[PDB]
Design a protein around this ligand. Structure first.
Ligand SMILES: O=P(O)(O)OC[C@@H](O)CO
Ligand SMILES: O=P(O)(O)OC[C@@H](O)CO
Lengths: 247, 247
């Protein structure tokens, strides 16, 4: 059985990946499952679960099981400060907010969660989490020293340090519900010098933005707000997934 | 040509590694080369260059070239705060002091050095740097929240988080010239749960301590003080290298 990381590396070697992020604290459990259902048929590759609204540990296990019961896609935990570790998920982004001003979001929370994670068979995927302007809630809670959306040099420094630290993915985060996404010149410049896949999330609502970011060099595209706030998830996500595969 | 990391992983799969650390700021350049010379014939596998005494960039290039001129061993930079990056070295431990109280030693200095390092063909080896009691100078300068030498749980948390972050090596550091080395129970407990090689340095002066730590599960042993402060380096290091290969 292929791991999620092997799956991503294979899918991104000559293609692009779309991922659907679902905030379990923003909707009831079976509403989350319906979103993941329609996301799967829109063509999404993985379901991400996480967000800013704080979670009940009893409630997140419900939403993950509801998603895995209605879909056959792998579910990856997109963790926050809440120690959102649950045994019912397939993988977890073991991430570090590299440009945070607080040790707790760079290494602190991850060290506390390490031993409990070692007791689970959940897959641990090392990922660098870079928060760009405007950052929204995650940039506020994470105490992020926000990278300007067009700052190629600062993004390159963090992305290169991520690769040299051994991280297998790097995530360019503009913040959930951000009006702007990360600049394409930043994605373009980093893709010239980096050997690990680049994931872009935050502010991607339209196929045109998803395609422009993929054409800029982004290997994976994450959409969260546009999937949780559309009354028909399929007709919102399907054109985004399609425009990404054109690249 | 094999990389240093591939070399270490091959040497540690069914054997142990000894490394000799040389402080370039503690001795003149050709005295450093003589130490590396006698260390090579004592049987050491790699030369490490670095330390606490602050370095002149002009002076460290001298010591590295002097070592590489007299020895055929690979030289790895053991960096401090000084941005000790030099083009004449074979590799650099791209390390993070995970238990530091300052962001600059966890991620700060490494982000600043990332782009200059990308312009060099020097090999970047991802390593987690864990500073144990008493820590000595590196624990003071690094603002380390010192891990007790027998604290299995705290060491396991940091070592596991290192592996889940993608680090390829973890370094148990007691401090240069420390009277005590890391407890063997800590090495023993971590070696049960970890998939990356464990390197132990600090306070290892005798073959008995080097052998006891290797028998405890340590994959690599670093000796610095005993090599720089012995008038005959060979007769000090040769029994240490031999007692390690018995394991
Ligand atoms: O909700 P959006 O704006 O699509 O962002 C997705 C993800 O990057 C937020 O954590
Ligand atoms: O000098 P010693 O005590 O051998 O320690 C080696 C290294 O761990 C110090 O940085």
């Amino acid at each position: 059985m292929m791991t999620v990381l092997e799956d991503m590396l294979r899918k991104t070697r000559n293609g692009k990946v779309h991922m659907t992020l679902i905030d379990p604290g923003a909707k009831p459990p079976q509403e989350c499952a319906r979103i993941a259902e329609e996301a799967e048929m829109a063509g999404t590759d993985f379901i991400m679960v996480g967000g800013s609204t704080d979670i009940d540990s009893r409630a997140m296990d419900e939403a993950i099981s509801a998603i895995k019961a209605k879909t056959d896609l792998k579910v990856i935990i997109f963790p926050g400060s809440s120690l959102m570790i649950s045994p019912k998920a397939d993988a977890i982004f073991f991430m570090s907010l590299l440009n945070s001003g607080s040790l707790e979001y760079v290494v602190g929370h991850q060290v506390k969660a390490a031993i409990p994670l070692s007791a689970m068979k959940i897959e641990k995927i090392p990922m660098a989490y870079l928060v760009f302007d405007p950052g929204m809630t995650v940039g506020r809670v994470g105490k992020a020293h926000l990278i300007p959306r067009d700052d190629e040099k600062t993004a390159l420094s963090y992305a290169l340090a991520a690769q040299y630290f051994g991280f297998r993915l790097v995530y360019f985060e503009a913040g959930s519900g951000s009006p702007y996404h990360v600049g394409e010149n930043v994605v373009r410049r980093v893709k010239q010098e980096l050997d690990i896949p680049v994931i872009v999330g935050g502010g991607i609502r339209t196929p045109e933005a998803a395609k422009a970011l993929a054409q800029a060099g982004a290997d994976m595209i994450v959409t969260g707000t546009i999937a949780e706030r559309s009354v028909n998830v399929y007709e919102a996500l399907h054109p985004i997934v399609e425009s990404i595969k054109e690249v």
